[PDB]
């Protein structure tokens, strides 16, 4: 069928002429120079004033028909050649490249009313097919299906990709075998097969170093060396304080020349002996005098209200739960959403977090209470951490991880050979970390590790000194005694769906040596199978609370009742207003 | 940008002082409003008459006349004068290569300076380089062109140098025709490479005007080539 291309266009260069050989942009003494159709003219050059000039002989680049229609934003045409120009070169028969750079040569609608007699383009524009792509940035509304270039099409509106951190955990949790019967390490006399580490499932040792640490030293200080950058978020993000807009004036753009949507005058002078008299001057003024009456033209725009919902929508909107989005029109999504492609294209309505939500507050978005805030993107720790490897995707690396198991680490040894063996982990969802906890395996993340050496600081004691203490601490008496920071066994209940009471139970025992209770609630999701070794259906990368402490349910308890045999109660003798049970909270108290 | 045949009919005529004398010429895929029309006497080069269909060039006399549109152009001598008596030629400027016809031959009823280099020949295979002094212009604001006319065939368009240095040559010579030139000598070069017998012609430095043919020659030059 008849259809007609359109063109949509802009050229900024002014050049000196133009003729089938181009634009002529300058001179080689006698001879005329042209644009080298390449790289040239340039997108970036153009005009050098603000005030407005009359261009006959002008040009500029654009895309070919057969190229895709992109939103500029986010585009990116990788160059071709060294010349910085983007415009695909095809491989001739006698095999050298060629250039597909085409001029398309334009006349004003004046002009083209003519006969053509006096006709010579006053616009010239260089039309080339450059391999487009987008590689941070998406549509945010795709207005049509239609195959090819269209005015329909250009109608697609952007916006960019999510941002996704991937990195080492703090400390390397979970790299390496604690806990887990098979996979157990070892640390052995060379002179006595008889491992000297003992390990189960009940044991928790990558918590006890981090509480461990937290009781020693400040951990918003970052050291790289044992990865020890701590997680962390944002409090202005977890818990909204809205104080509304400090936009009390008017803020203003103005035009390139500050005034604007002007008028022509001519100039008058007055005759001296009459109350009104008035002749015209055209003699040394113009008679073409521009003048803009009134005030210069302007736009207005509120700063803060912007700068307002544009920190809401990025740091809380996105992150909302699933049940308040929708997926978009014409663009298609993963059926899996645990993929970063549902995660990044999932529409959340502005309306919802917008100005005036929880305004005069300081309250947390509801929906957010039972999100994880750690798995966030301002997370200062998991961003450094991501910059200790680098911005790429590709890292050799080089990291030092210190033995964390209480029992091993305080230990001072003394003269022999001793076998020490380890194990460590290569599952990318538990020795690599991401924001949105995102499923590594099928996101397609790869580590693979290439050597490994086991350093360990010795003090060069005098050897009469260093006798006399080995004397002294081969003694019976004189054995070394170590215990745990954690020092408690740790256990794990399943609570099915809406399931508001939870009972258990313990069989009857000896109850000397205990120490007292503690207790938090998890998510199913969020916690890795004990002893498994490795585990398939477990598709959750983000913080790991059983591991790093990150627990955020405590909330979600209502009261707790210990009682111990058939009607024994705990501490009972009449101590609480609620003797027998622990009341956390109650809705609305008027006693 | 292709091959236009242009066919002139009659191929001879026969006239006498005062004759009313008709030519035609017939393009095989159109030219539109561009035919032009020259005459050419046998020993000196070829002369503007009509270009655009039915313009005179300076100074060409009254008696003759253009006409015509798309494929088909006429040329009348309104009553035939004893200079007419020369062969003319059809040609186009609508594409490149440039085209001409075979010369049609009448017979009786019984400012600018282009100067090129003199006369030589040469064996099979050898190279030959003629120069075409330029005065009365500047090389940068025209585009020289180079026609050669072989001894009984028509015009071949051999190929141009534009104002600005972009070459361009006619397909038939297989890329031996070279042209250079040297702006501040105010000369164009013109290298020929592999020679043949059928390369033995005069060879001519032209240049058109503003934006309508050829109307300032050189004096020609002539090549020979034989065994």
């Known amino acids: 069928e008849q259809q007609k291309t359109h063109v949509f266009g802009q050229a900024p260069y002014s050049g000196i002429n133009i003729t089938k050989e181009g634009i002529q942009i300058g001179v080689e003494g006698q001879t005329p120079k042209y644009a080298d159709k390449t790289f040239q003219p340039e997108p970036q050059i153009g005009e050098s004033q603000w005030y407005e000039t009359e261009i006959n002989h002008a040009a500029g680049r654009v895309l070919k028909k057969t190229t895709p229609m992109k939103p500029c934003y986010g585009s990116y045409a990788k160059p071709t050649n060294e010349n910085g120009g983007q415009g695909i070169l095809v491989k001739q028969q006698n095999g050298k490249l060629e250039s597909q750079v085409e001029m398309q040569f334009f006349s004003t609608t004046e002009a083209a009313a003519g006969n053509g007699d006096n006709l010579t383009p006053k616009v010239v524009l260089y039309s080339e097919d450059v391999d487009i792509e987008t590689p941070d940035t998406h549509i945010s509304y795709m207005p049509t299906i239609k195959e090819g270039n269209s005015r329909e099409l250009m109608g697609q509106q952007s916006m960019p990709n999510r941002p996704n951190y991937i990195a080492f955990r703090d400390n390397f949790i979970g790299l390496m075998y604690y806990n887990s019967t098979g996979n157990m390490g070892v640390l052995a006399g060379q002179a006595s097969q008889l491992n000297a580490v003992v390990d189960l499932q009940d044991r928790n040792t990558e918590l006890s170093y981090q509480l461990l640490l937290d009781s020693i030293g400040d951990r918003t200080r970052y050291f790289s060396m044992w990865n020890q950058a701590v997680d962390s978020y944002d409090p202005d993000v977890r818990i909204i304080e809205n104080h509304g807009t400090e936009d009390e004036l008017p803020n203003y753009c103005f035009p390139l020349g500050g005034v604007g949507n002007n008028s022509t005058y001519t100039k008058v002078k007055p005759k001296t002996g009459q109350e009104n008299g008035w002749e015209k001057d055209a003699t040394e003024f113009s008679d073409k005098n521009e003048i803009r009456v009134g005030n210069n033209f302007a736009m207005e725009i509120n700063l803060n209200a912007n700068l307002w919902r544009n920190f809401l929508y990025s740091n809380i909107a996105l992150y909302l739960p699933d049940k308040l989005k929708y997926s978009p029109s014409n663009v298609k999504i993963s059926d899996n959403p645990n993929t970063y492609d549902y995660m990044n294209k999932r529409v959340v309505a502005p309306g919802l977090v917008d100005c005036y939500i929880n305004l005069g507050a300081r309250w947390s978005l509801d929906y957010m209470d039972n999100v994880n805030p750690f798995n966030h993107h301002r997370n200062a720790g998991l961003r450094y951490r991501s910059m200790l490897l680098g911005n790429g995707r590709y890292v050799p690396f080089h990291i030092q991880v210190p033995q964390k198991f209480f029992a091993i680490k305080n230990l001072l040894l003394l003269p022999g050979s001793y076998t020490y063996e380890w194990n460590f982990r290569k599952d990318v969802n538990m020795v690599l970390q991401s924001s949105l906890g995102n499923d590594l395996r099928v996101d397609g993340a790869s580590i693979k590790f290439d050597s490994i050496c086991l350093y360990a600081t010795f003090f060069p004691m005098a050897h009469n000194t260093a006798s006399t203490l080995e004397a002294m601490l081969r003694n019976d008496t004189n054995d070394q005694s170590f215990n745990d920071y954690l020092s408690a066994a740790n256990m794990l209940y399943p609570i099915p769906a809406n399931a508001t009471n939870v009972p258990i139970s313990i069989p009857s025992r000896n109850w000397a040596a205990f120490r007292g209770w503690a207790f938090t609630r998890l998510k199913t999701k969020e916690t890795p199978s004990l002893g498994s070794g490795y585990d398939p259906y477990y598709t959750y990368s983000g913080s790991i609370p059983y591991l790093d402490g990150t627990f955020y349910l405590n909330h979600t308890f209502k009261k707790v009742a210990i009682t111990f045999d058939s009607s024994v109660s705990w501490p009972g003798n009449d101590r609480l207003l609620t003797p027998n049970e622990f009341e956390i909270k109650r809705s609305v108290d008027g006693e | 940008d292709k091959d236009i045949v242009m066919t002139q009919s009659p191929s001879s005529l026969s006239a006498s002082v005062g004759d009313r004398v008709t030519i035609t010429c017939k393009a095989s895929?159109?030219?539109?409003?561009?035919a032009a029309w020259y005459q050419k006497k046998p020993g000196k080069a070829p002369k503007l008459l009509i270009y655009?269909?039915?313009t005179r060039y300076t100074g060409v006399p009254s008696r003759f006349s253009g006409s015509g549109y798309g494929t088909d152009f006429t040329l009348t001598i309104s009553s035939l004068q004893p200079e007419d008596f020369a062969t003319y030629f059809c040609?186009?400027?609508?594409?490149?290569?440039?085209?001409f016809g075979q010369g049609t031959k009448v017979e009786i009823k019984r400012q600018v300076q282009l100067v090129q280099s003199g006369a030589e020949d040469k064996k099979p295979g050898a190279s030959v380089k003629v120069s075409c002094k330029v005065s009365?212009?500047?090389?940068?604001?025209?585009?020289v062109h180079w026609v050669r006319q072989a001894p009984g065939q028509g015009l071949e368009w051999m190929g141009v140098?534009?104002?600005?240095?972009?070459?361009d040559y006619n397909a038939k010579f297989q890329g031996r025709v070279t042209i250079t030139k040297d702006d501040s000598k105010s000369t164009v070069y013109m290298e020929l490479s592999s020679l043949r017998s059928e390369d033995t012609a005069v060879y001519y430095c032209?240049?058109?005007?503003?934006?309508?043919?050829?109307?300032?020659w050189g004096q020609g030059t002539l090549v020979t080539v034989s065994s």
């Open positions: 032209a240049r058109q005007g503003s934006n309508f043919p050829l109307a300032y």
């Open positions: 009365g212009f500047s090389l940068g604001r025209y585009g």
């Open positions: 140098i534009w104002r600005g240095g972009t070459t």
């Open positions: 895929q159109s030219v539109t409003n561009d």
């Open positions: 655009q269909a039915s």
């Open positions: 040609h186009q400027d609508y594409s490149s290569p440039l085209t």
